[PDB]
Amino acid sequence: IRRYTDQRSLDRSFGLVGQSFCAALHQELREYYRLLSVLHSQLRLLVWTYDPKIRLKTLAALVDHCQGRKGGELASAVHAYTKTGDPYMRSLVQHILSLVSH
Amino acid sequence: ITEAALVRDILYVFQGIDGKNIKMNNTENCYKVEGKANLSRSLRDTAVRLSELGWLHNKIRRYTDQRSLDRSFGLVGQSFCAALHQELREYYRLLSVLHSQLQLTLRRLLVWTYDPKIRLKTLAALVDHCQGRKGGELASAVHAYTKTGDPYMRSLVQHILSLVSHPVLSFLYRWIYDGELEDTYHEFFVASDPTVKTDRLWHDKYTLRKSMIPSFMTMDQSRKVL
Amino acid sequence: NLNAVRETMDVLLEISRILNTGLDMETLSICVRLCEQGINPEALSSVIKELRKATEALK
Amino acid sequence: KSPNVLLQNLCCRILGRSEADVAQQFQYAVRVIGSNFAPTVERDEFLVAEKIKKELIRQRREADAALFSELHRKLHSQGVLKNKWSILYLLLSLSEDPRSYATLFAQALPRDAHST
């Protein structure tokens, strides 16, 4: 996810909806850096590392589903990818869908 | 050598006063560092960076150091030098405040500078360009530095030019109201012709001298007051 | 006057926000409707201070 | 007493109009006395004593100037008043002349000797 979102910030043929998608992904990346800050200060912690091992999966899945898009097909691969009943993913899509629709 | 010495030395270098870990005072045309500790940027780069504040101090004080013994500079140049006494007074005030708070690196004193070196940057041109200007040729040489694009700088020399334009608002208050002006250093544009006292008075004894007109008066404005 | 009571309701919001009261917009609407009757406010102090207390007693 | 409630007492003393009569002067008062509420210059009672001497020279009375010194001895003898600079500076500011320059005069130091 860090590779793709930095690659498309050197792209301007990715549209301006792709740039909103990418801005959202930067902000999602920020919280995973928050975790790795906390952990670096302490330098088995499975329980620490179990909760983002679910979270990063769904984000990279969202990135992979929206492979090579711009415009209303990226608002029909980020809004057409909200058809779950999993409330942990429902929370994840808001803070991405909100930026994309703007 | 220790770092706690460096801050009090460079403090003096701001004032131009000799240090102890730096024995230069713009003697080699600039300040260089004597004494090492193998710090290549925290004893060398920072110190040389901050010593040019003192170089600028040497310049701005150097001009005043001669003009205050110069009694033939006008009274508009000796008001320019009186706004240039204030610009040393304020420098001393800043140094006074920082000196008490030093009682140790402070990002090598770069918190307290970088807004310093905007006034010094402007006065480095006012103390290079104005050299041999007295009278109204100086009130156009501070009026060309008030076209600056930075809002800080335009109001900076609108302060200096507010001070400088006080004798010229008293020369203009007595070529009009008294109607006769008299100065032994020509800062005003009346060029009187000696032994004209007869009925060639209405024709002669007034010629618009064109090295003493300020630039807040265009030519026509000076053509009427005559 | 119907335009005026809306503006006075909106100017009333800030001094209940910046004084660190327990009120937001909903409690302001309830309490402004209660005060229009003639009910004493020094008593309403206690019911607001206890509604905010009784939830913390459960935790 | 706390200052904000104290100023309406002040205005009931000066005006003949109650605290439920006027709130406009109290609005001007809360604007001016607050945000100028910390001493921005230095404070010491010795200086304001040497300026009450300077006022009494302007009255051309030197007999009251030599009793004011024994009053200033008394002020040191009791030593129970919190700020002695302020009240003398205020009564000095409100002085009346029974009938000049200040660019050679000094004032209090501007807290440019202050440190954090």
Add this chain to the structure above:
Amino acid sequence: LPARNKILMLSFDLRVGGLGPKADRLEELVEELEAVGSVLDLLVQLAGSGPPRDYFLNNKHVGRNVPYSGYDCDDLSVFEMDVQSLISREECLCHSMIQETLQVMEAAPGTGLPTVGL
């Protein structure tokens, strides 16, 4: 004791702790609050018992003109508090994130699952 005076007595207490223009807005508010009265008497009993940059502050490079006010250069230390409040929030967060999970890594067993309490 009037209604608009009780807002003024807290404008003063605004002015003591800095924040001049906030009190300057409050006094623009007090003239329309009384040139509803029973609500503000409820606001003074709840006063402090509830639940808990800008490019026009210390810059002079913006503006069509600026007023010249000389060197001050002692408000650059309270531009560091302008940042210090941010970085002291982002380290208080890391103290309440290491605590809530070391309290679950280390505790008496049987307290992290209530079904083991049966």
Add this chain to the structure above:
Amino acid sequence: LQQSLELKRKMLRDKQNKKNSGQHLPIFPAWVYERPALIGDFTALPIGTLPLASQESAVVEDLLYVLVGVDGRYVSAQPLAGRQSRTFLVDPNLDLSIRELVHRILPVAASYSAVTRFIEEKSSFEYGQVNHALAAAMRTLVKEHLILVSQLEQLHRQGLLSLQKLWFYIQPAMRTMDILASLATSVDKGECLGGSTLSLLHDRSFSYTGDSQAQELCLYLTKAASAPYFEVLEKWIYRGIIHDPYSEFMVEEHELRKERIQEDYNDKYWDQRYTIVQQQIPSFLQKMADKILSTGKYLNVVRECGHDVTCPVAKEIIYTLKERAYVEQIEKAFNYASKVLLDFLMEEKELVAHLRSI
């Protein structure tokens, strides 16, 4: 470095000759440009043979100095010190894990050196008031970066800053510096000054609309840059007289009376003496571009034939995001100028009697 001093003098002669109220257009002295000790952009062992938990700390201190342009100890600024770009060489003996992270933190360092050199070199007089203001509002963010690294030094003394913490802390300002350095490179590439880098800012403000971290920055920089332009516009709209000491304005003033005189045998005063420039328009005045010229030209041809009049009202307005206050003011002064010219024309030396007697 060597190249800029040429360009400055060649540009300086042009605006000095062109405008007759812009005479003796000055320059700052040479030492202001030459020595790099007037900006922030200026024991010792190979750290790789050392233990690991000292390497990171040494690199954190050096890199924190590097960010504000002070060239570090184990990070050297590679010798070019020209264009709006710089490169650095960290030690190779350094452990691979630490060095890789250093590379990830390094874009903001290049993106500082580029910014500060712009702020010195392109604030000179030939670039004009708008480029001066753009540099002066870039400078406040540079000041903020300085403010940051002072407090972070105290954190590193307390055993509280790591390289992972350092990267984390510098992330919000990295984007800001990135925007500033890209803008400076663009201004260099098109040789944009005056209004050609007031259209660039106007496009950039629309460009970011999905991030809103960068959009507010761009809005601030164009608010800063549009203040000197609107002064000249205010003069031109309420009068027919401008000063324009360095060329930034769409209207230019020519001087001809050598061919036609005492009468206009073609109306040269009223047609082409005041002409338009299509390359100094800020591209939000482009919709009004004809109307701007007409608004002041009509004042010239009424104040010359014998008349005196001033502004309807004074409004000092600036750039607003996606929004326009100036359209209304330009229209209201335009109709007013046409009205005063028409009233004067139809009564004083009236056209009606002229046409009757034809």
Add this chain to the structure above:
Amino acid sequence: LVHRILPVAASYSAVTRFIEEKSSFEYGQVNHALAAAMRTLVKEHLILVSQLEQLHRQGLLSLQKLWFYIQPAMRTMDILASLATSVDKGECLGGSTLSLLHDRSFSYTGDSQAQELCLYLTKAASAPY
């Protein structure tokens, strides 16, 4: 820095000698009034240095602060010292040292700090005349 601050002490010995020698009856009525209002300027310097002494006693003064405080009075003493040298050198007395004051009040107008000094000395010295 001590070298730079020493001329206000030279310009204290200079200022104090005139007030003693030029108040007597061998220099006319105007020199009495002039020297008796030059004394006031010494009095206010004493006022200043008491203020400095208190803060210095509490361990709070420094040489840098002292310099900033004394600079305006350094200008004041310098004006008085130059004037005293000129009054002695031309043997100025009577109305010949009311021409000098008249000239010096005209000379400065650049800050009006020195102008106020000379206007004060003239208003005090012109009373007997």
